[PDB]
């Protein structure tokens, strides 16, 4: 499957300020309300069937990293799959380009 590559941020030192959990739950509740309508967007990717191309809405004017996630056909992701060779393509390298 294709997914957007959500990179880690910098590992800044883990302070234990409990207040952070409140602002995380505030943002999660606002996100749960927005998940009713933002369903068309690239952040709302639903796991596709084989060959089931999805339309996703995305803003112009940026670069974006993607990840090729590999599974067995029980559907489990591999703990390592670094023996494979990948092939990255686009229908138009003016509109969107690796």
């Amino acid at each position: 499957q294709l997914q957007v590559a959500n990179l880690p941020k910098d590992h800044q030192i883990q302070d234990s300020s409990h207040h952070q959990q409140i602002q995380q739950q505030e943002q999660q509740q606002q996100q749960q309300q927005q998940q009713s309508t933002c369903q068309d967007t690239i952040f709302s990717i639903k796991k596709q069937k084989q060959g089931e191309i999805g339309t996703y809405k995305i803003r112009n004017d940026r670069d974006i990293p993607f990840i090729a996630q590999v599974f067995d056909d029980n559907g489990k992701p591999f703990t390592n799959y670094s023996s494979l060779v990948f092939d990255w393509k686009s229908s138009d390298q003016t509109q969107a380009k690796w």
């Binding site: 739950q25 505030e26 509740q29 009713s36």
Partner: protein, 49 residues
């Protein structure tokens, strides 16, 4: 495991529908009964089933 009580009369239970986005708002607002997939039906005051 595999045995129950022979009979249970305890009909008064606190049944709810829960809304999956209700994370923050500790507010007594009359939320619009339009966005839910389901509704809990009223108990009829007909003869005891």
């Amino acid at each position: 495991k595999g045995v129950h009580f022979d009979s249970c009369n305890l009909d008064d239970l606190e049944w709810r529908v829960d809304d999956s986005n209700a994370n923050n708002d500790n507010n007594g607002g009359g939320g619009s009964n339009q966005e839910r997939s389901f509704s809990l039906l009223p108990l009829q005051k007909t003869n005891t089933p």
